[PDB]
């Protein structure tokens, strides 16, 4: 399949080089698998979704996504217009109130939530986690983590926004889940996206166009735009038989787009999420 003038996020996780429009990728799309968005929220019923969107936990008055952020990150992993495995489910956990903050107590138990929730859900291909989120270290978050990890979800978490070493962050320094630094249309580490040994992955993060709430859409920047391509192409593979929840990370970090990245610090990986699609 090929979809034109796609967002640049898109074009650039299937292609080997920066500056192109299109969005090539296998008409599977991600059916049968899930992703959990571990956010805001979702506007399910926003068209851009077709039903495939739905909100399964909320530790607030309401399910409501009443900021945006997780509608966005929804919308990367699949929305049919923005997203990366456009025929995935989408199962919303809203952590975050509407101002964009949650305590990490309540940021643990909806990843235990997903942890279980999954066995509810049929997920034949696989169960991928996005955590578009995080504050400072805690080692109650990063075992979170990494309980949802072991069993048997693709956890992809966001690196953080702080131009600083993500180990100084959770969950982004937890070793066992797949932490995604953000990158620009011209192959550059965006500015802000953390960096050091503990990622595993770059992806798309600068000006990134995806869904919103109103059933609108707009552009956004952060580490947190990134996760969801990780976790939208992790989707997307696991469909297509390439790797499963446990394996998923490493196999998108052996099959990346290798030292084509620009302002990445000594000692961080030179690796961009790319899905090898040829047709
Ligand atoms: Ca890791």
Not at 156 to 169: I, K, L, Q, S
Not at 180 to 195: I, L, T
């Given at each position: 399949?090929?979809?034109?003038?796609?967002?640049?996020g898109?074009?650039?996780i299937?292609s080997?080089s920066?500056?192109?429009?299109?969005?090539?990728?296998?008409?599977?799309?991600?059916?049968?698998?899930?992703?959990?968005?571990?956010?805001?929220?979702?506007?399910?019923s926003?068209?851009?979704?077709?039903?495939?969107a739905?909100?399964?936990?909320?530790?607030?008055?309401?399910?409501?996504?009443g900021?945006?952020?997780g509608?966005?990150?929804?919308?990367?992993v699949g929305?049919?217009?923005?997203?990366?495995?456009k025929?995935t489910?989408?199962?919303?956990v809203?952590?975050?109130?509407?101002?964009?903050?949650?305590?990490?107590?309540?940021?643990?138990?909806?990843?235990?939530?997903?942890?279980?929730d999954?066995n509810?859900?049929?997920?034949?291909?696989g169960?991928?986690?996005?955590?578009?989120?995080?504050?400072?270290?805690?080692?109650?978050?990063?075992?979170?983590?990494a309980?949802?990890?072991?069993?048997?979800?693709?956890?992809?978490?966001?690196?953080?926004?702080?131009?600083?070493?993500?180990?100084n962050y959770?969950?982004?320094?937890?070793?066992?889940?797949?932490?995604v630094?953000?990158?620009?249309?011209?192959?550059?580490?965006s500015?802000f996206?953390?960096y050091?040994?503990?990622?595993?992955?770059?992806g798309?993060?600068?000006d990134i166009?995806?869904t919103?709430?109103?059933?609108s859409?707009?552009?956004?920047?952060?580490?947190?735009?990134?996760?969801?391509?990780?976790?939208?192409?992790?989707?997307?593979?696991?469909?297509?038989?390439?790797?499963?929840?446990?394996?998923?990370?490493?196999?998108?970090?052996?099959?990346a787009?290798?030292?084509?990245?620009?302002?990445?610090?000594?000692?961080?990986?030179?690796?961009?999420?790319?899905?090898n699609?040829?047709?």
């Amino acid at each position: 399949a090929a979809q034109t003038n796609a967002p640049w996020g898109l074009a650039r996780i299937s292609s080997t080089s920066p500056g192109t429009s299109t969005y090539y990728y296998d008409e599977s799309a991600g059916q049968g698998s899930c992703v959990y968005v571990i956010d805001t929220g979702i506007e399910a019923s926003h068209p851009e979704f077709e039903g495939r969107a739905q909100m399964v936990k909320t530790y607030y008055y309401s399910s409501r996504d009443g900021n945006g952020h997780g509608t966005h990150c929804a919308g990367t992993v699949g929305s049919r217009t923005y997203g990366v495995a456009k025929k995935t489910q989408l199962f919303g956990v809203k952590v975050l109130d509407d101002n964009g903050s949650g305590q990490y107590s309540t940021i643990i138990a909806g990843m235990d939530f997903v942890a279980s929730d999954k066995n509810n859900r049929n997920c034949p291909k696989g169960v991928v986690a996005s955590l578009s989120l995080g504050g400072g270290y805690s080692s109650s978050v990063n075992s979170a983590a990494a309980r949802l990890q072991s069993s048997g979800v693709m956890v992809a978490v966001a690196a953080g926004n702080n131009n600083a070493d993500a180990r100084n962050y959770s969950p982004a320094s937890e070793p066992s889940v797949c932490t995604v630094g953000a990158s620009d249309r011209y192959d550059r580490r965006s500015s802000f996206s953390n960096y050091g040994s503990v990622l595993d992955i770059f992806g798309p993060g600068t000006d990134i166009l995806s869904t919103w709430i109103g059933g609108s859409t707009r552009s956004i920047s952060g580490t947190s735009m990134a996760t969801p391509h990780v976790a939208g192409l992790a989707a997307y593979l696991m469909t297509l038989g390439k790797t499963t929840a446990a394996s998923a990370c490493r196999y998108i970090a052996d099959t990346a787009n290798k030292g084509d990245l620009s302002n990445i610090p000594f000692g961080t990986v030179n690796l961009l999420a790319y899905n090898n699609y040829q047709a």
